Write a protein that binds this DNA or RNA. Structure first.
Ligand code: MG
Ligand code: MG
Length: 170
RNA sequence: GGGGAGUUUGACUGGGGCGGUACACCUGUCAAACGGUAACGCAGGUGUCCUAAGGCGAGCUCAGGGAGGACAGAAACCUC
């Protein structure tokens, strides 16, 4: 048997692009990201100052956004279609989440505009389960127990069964 | 305008002088489980800075570590 609603569902999908310098490149990356995600993304300032990468304290160097639900699985479907539903054993974290990256963006269904240029990005997905909001709600916060959490094997099974993908070793 | 006049040229202090400030303040210890308690005892700090680094209210949680993610690495950004 099974519990009808202890099943696995994706609860958020995070997209980010880290360009490493503020300016026209940054705002065009924000533009392509918001065109892809249908909503305005946000800028993240540099935490520290390191001159090896040519960055300083508190300038926007990356643009990221998060999605839930319908648009989340559509974007994830596009990304996995680009990655031909192929992932590696080490692509999955110990907490049940996973992710990957796309070297360039116009392949997943984005028209090439010569002005904006080309940009890669990182997809990440946080596998969830009904009741995970306990860990972050305000009134009576608590843990999510031991049985209810997600492990690497469960994430692998969910990925290979729902999206009929292949986990090549590596 | 030392030609001439009057006067002054601190204190502390293992003699005085040179050095130093133990000369006004602050922290720990000395200090002997109330408080107080000495030495040129020990380790140090002060003559500032702030329109917010003051005053309320709201919302968040930090250092670090582990596991993941294109360039990305020991270190850039995202997630748990
Ligand atoms: Mg005389
Ligand atoms: Mg006594």
């Amino acid at each position: 048997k099974e519990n009808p609603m202890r099943e696995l569902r994706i609860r958020k999908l995070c997209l980010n692009i880290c360009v490493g310098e503020s300016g026209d490149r940054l705002t065009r990356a924000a533009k392509v990201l918001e065109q892809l995600t249908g909503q305005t993304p946000v800028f993240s300032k540099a935490r520290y100052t390191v001159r090896s990468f040519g960055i300083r304290r508190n300038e926007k160097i990356a643009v990221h956004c998060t999605v839930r639900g319908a648009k989340a699985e559509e974007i994830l479907e596009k990304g996995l279609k680009v990655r031909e539903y192929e992932l590696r054993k080490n692509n999955f974290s110990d907490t049940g989440n996973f992710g990957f990256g796309i070297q360039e963006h116009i392949d997943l269904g984005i028209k090439y505009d010569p002005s904006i240029g080309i940009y890669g990005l990182d997809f990440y997905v946080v596998l969830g389960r009904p009741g995970f909001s306990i860990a972050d709600k305000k009134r009576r916060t608590g843990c999510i127990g031991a049985k209810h959490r997600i492990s690497k094997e469960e994430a692998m099974r969910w990925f290979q069964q729902k999206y009929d993908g292949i986990i090549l070793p590596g």
